[PDB]
Design a protein around this ligand. Structure first.
Ligand SMILES: [Zn+2]
Ligand SMILES: [Zn+2]
Lengths: 422, 155, 145, 48, 41
């Protein structure tokens, strides 16, 4: 219960130590700025604690990473496994997909959940042992009681459900957030071993103050098109290099003046990577590596060639990058403004408009705050599930039956008690 | 108690003669009628729901208005505690059901991590997602949120 | 008080030309497009500085010969070994670069370390210049929108 | 203009059908009647 | 703005000396004429 209480504490004190771990990462950045090439070491100022607090703060930061992954296990991991168990249980309810459908080789996320139905302790952290025996009752009269039996299946060592835990952690590993923080802890491990890569913990600034994160979202949602466009660019560089391999085998000399043993980019690779490294990090042209206009009539077309590079490369490059990034920003600002539209024009349950509901002294506002009052439907559902069905009203038992039915017409189609008479 | 400026003094003395008469003058506030006053709070809650629904179904009645303002302090107390929605209760007409909201669920709803999951969910239901079964996805979020506040209070 | 200091020392006296910050309003709306978003701008430049920090640190462990500050190296050159010196070197060079660090890099001589070093310069070019222009004019034109 | 054209395609497939052309104001009175109105009442390939 | 309510000449350039003595009248029967005297000065 000491350790139970401490897990409770790390649950209820979780984001604060996360931001403190970020502050310790800033302190890591504070030190990694006085290294000297001799092996390496640290210089000295009036503060006299470089190496001891170095080692101590490294071990401390790694321990805080351990604390946050244990707390994150104590945090949302049951919520995510709750969502998973809910989805699997209701898909055996409304489909019986492991009875009947047998889904494809895509989503062995889903077929991963086959071998947990093997466990007798399958539907644990979803409170809903109803679902197991209801699905047991619902189909095996059609398809087999043997099929029902198949879909059945200090000192505490083997009296715990092993395969449930295996399935559980396999679902846990699918999280991007969990793998993110676990990989972060292993980075703290490698810095505990070798504190050269130790300052690479500064992807902690990828999941704090959200505006940078929305900028990263503007990066990542479009990035398939970005990467394929850079691949198209590489195709252009490839063929464009190949053009200056057939007709052009003298205009490059890598050494000084050519008498020193110069190199024309004849080799495919060498010429490939040469055009890549030169012309991408160019600053417009290949006016550096080109032979200047000396008067050759081949060199006329070679200057035209450099012009075609300039035009069909630099324009294209800027079109690749900031057109797509500002396009991402336009869609991000559009999405946020449409969120602010729909929270102020038509509610989820209202769905009419702010034309009707402002007739009286701020009735649209109170209509939002009271008549659809989004969290109070949540509280109502709590109030149902907390009560017993004998205790229900006919209204309460009615909505309960509609909820069990998963039929959803009991919710308003949009019109309200203000709409009927007023 | 009279320095709290609130009550009427004969009724303060009524509460005094009610109080405990516990053997010198001492009195525990919890053991007063308080512990039984929360079921009295439940009764007055139901009365408030009742008078509320009276006003809601049948408004504009000066008899009922006088009776309503007569019950002013109860509606002042219990509007933080009531629950109210609207549905179509199988009568093919727009209806409304008034009910209870406990407070500890609101204290774990006071947790703004739920509020930001909610606002991201707002973003989802507005744009990010196939508009397939809007309120059903909402209730999926609700069941998850129920489980979330179970986790939150259970710590 | 700026007029007072110019009355005392008329060197800073011409710094009164922030008077053009509160007249003809169109410039002021441009300054408004600057200032309302600027929290995101400053935090993004801080992110850029984090990238430069770690990216410098990468060329501190594996890369300790490809920079020589003097002429030809026989004159007493300096590899950017020091954390700070290498920090501010990458800042002042690569930010005011013009795309690449093709100046300070050793050219392709044929070393297989130098292959990855050229790939390193390419990663700088790509993950820096694109990001920079995305920082500045995407956000400024977003402000204008 | 490309993002405008794609978003207006996603508008008109979800607001006013080719044959409906009224809006999603009228047709959502019942349990998802606008959706079924699309899938059934104008059901584009079934005229074909 | 706490320590300007200490001043007797608090609500000067708002023409509205109403507000001082109305707030003086409105709450100190509940909470104290001495509280009214403190919010005077
Ligand atoms: Zn509604
Ligand atoms: Zn039609």
């Amino acid at each position: 219960a000491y350790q139970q209480k401490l897990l409770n504490y790390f649950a209820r004190n979780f984001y604060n130590m996360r931001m403190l771990a970020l502050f310790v990462a800033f302190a890591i950045n504070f030190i990694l700025l006085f290294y000297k090439v001799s092996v390496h070491y640290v210089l000295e100022e009036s503060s006299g604690y470089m190496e001891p607090t170095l080692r101590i703060l490294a071990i401390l930061h790694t321990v805080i990473s351990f604390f946050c992954i244990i707390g994150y296990y104590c945090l949302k991991v049951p919520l995510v496994i709750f969502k998973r168990e809910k989805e699997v249980a209701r898909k055996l309810e409304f489909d019986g997909l492991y009875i009947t459908e047998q889904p494809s080789e895509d989503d062995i996320k889903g077929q991963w959940d086959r071998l947990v139905i093997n466990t007798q302790s399958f539907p644990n952290n979803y409170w809903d042992k109803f679902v197991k025996r209801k699905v047991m009752d619902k189909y095996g009269e059609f398809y087999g009681r043997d099929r029902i039996s198949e879909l059945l299946g200090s000192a505490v060592l083997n009296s715990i459900d092993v395969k449930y835990q295996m399935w559980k952690l396999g679902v846990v590993f699918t999280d991007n957030s969990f793998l993110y923080l676990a990989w972060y802890m292993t980075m703290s491990v490698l810095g505990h071993y070798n504190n050269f890569f130790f300052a690479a913990h500064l992807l902690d600034i990828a999941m704090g103050f959200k505006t940078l994160r929305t900028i990263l979202s503007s990066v990542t949602h479009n990035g398939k098109q970005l990467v394929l466009t850079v691949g198209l660019l590489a195709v252009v560089v490839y063929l464009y290099t190949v053009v200056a391999f057939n007709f052009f085998r003298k205009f490059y000399n890598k050494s000084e003046d050519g008498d020193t043993p110069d190199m024309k980019c004849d080799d495919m690779l060498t010429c490939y990577m040469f055009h890549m490294y030169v012309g991408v990090r160019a600053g417009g042209g290949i006016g550096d590596e080109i032979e200047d206009p000396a008067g050759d009539e081949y060199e006329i077309y070679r200057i035209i060639f450099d012009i075609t590079f300039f035009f069909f490369v630099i324009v294209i490059l800027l079109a690749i990058i900031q057109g797509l990034i500002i396009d991402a920003f336009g869609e991000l600002r559009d999405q946020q403004e449409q969120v602010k539209e729909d929270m102020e024009t038509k509610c989820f349950i209202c769905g009419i408009g702010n034309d009707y509901f402002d007739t009286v002294p701020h009735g649209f506002e109170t209509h939002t705050l009271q008549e659809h009052n989004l969290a109070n439907y949540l509280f109502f559902l709590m109030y149902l599930i907390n009560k017993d069905e004998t205790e229900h009203t006919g209204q309460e038992s009615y909505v309960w039956k509609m909820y069990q039915e998963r039929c959803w017409e009991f919710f308003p189609a949009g019109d309200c008690f203000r709409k009927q008479y007023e | 108690m009279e320095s709290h400026k609130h009550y009427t003094q004969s009724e303060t003395e009524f509460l005094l003669s009610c109080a405990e008469t516990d053997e010198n003058e001492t009195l525990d506030y919890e053991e007063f009628v308080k512990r039984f006053h929360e079921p009295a709070k439940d009764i007055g809650f139901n009365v408030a729901v009742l008078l509320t629904n009276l006003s809601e179904h049948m408004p504009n009645d000066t008899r009922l208005q006088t009776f309503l303002e007569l019950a002013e302090s109860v509606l002042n107390y219990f509007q933080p505690f009531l629950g109210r929605i609207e549905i179509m209760g199988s009568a093919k007409r727009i209806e409304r059901v008034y009910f209870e909201i406990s407070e500890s669920s609101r204290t774990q709803w006071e947790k703004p991590q739920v509020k930001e999951s909610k606002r991201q969910f707002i973003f989802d239901v507005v744009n990010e997602g196939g508009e397939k079964e809007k309120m059903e996805l909402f209730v999926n979020f609700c069941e998850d949120t129920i489980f979330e506040m179970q986790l939150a209070a259970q710590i």
